[PDB]
Ligand binder design. Structure first.
Ligand SMILES: *[C@@H]1O[C@H](CO)[C@@H](O)[C@H](O)[C@H]1NC(C)=O
Lengths: 49, 49
């Protein structure tokens, strides 16, 4: 997936209270929204437990 | 831009303003336009002749 020319907030992508696991390295989860980047790529697939 | 003419476009000046931006990120080398036809009671209704 490729996202460009869009302003989105991740807060609603976190307050669902339904994700079993969460992992994010390199940047703090609470201060990545302010940190501006160029493009965001989504790597969606399925996997076993 | 409204006009009352068939062919041989007028010499008047009119600028063009953007409406929306599309950030595909992929080069394009060919294009093609689409047209809509009508199927009235005069035609048999088949798209052959
Ligand atoms: C143009 O498109 C082709 C086909 O996808 C691709 O292989 C090529 O790298 C593209 N060129 C540029 C400059 O993006």
């Amino acid at each position: 997936k490729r996202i460009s020319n869009c302003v989105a907030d991740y807060s609603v992508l976190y307050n669902s209270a339904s994700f079993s696991t969460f992992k994010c390295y390199g940047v703090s989860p609470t201060k990545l929204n302010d940190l501006c980047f160029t493009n965001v790529y989504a790597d969606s697939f399925v996997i076993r437990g | 831009t409204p006009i009352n003419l068939v062919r041989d476009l007028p010499q008047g000046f009119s600028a063009l303003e953007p409406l929306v931006d599309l950030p595909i990120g992929i080069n394009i080398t060919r294009f093609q336009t689409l047209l809509a036809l009508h199927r009235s009671y005069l035609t048999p209704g088949d798209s052959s002749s």
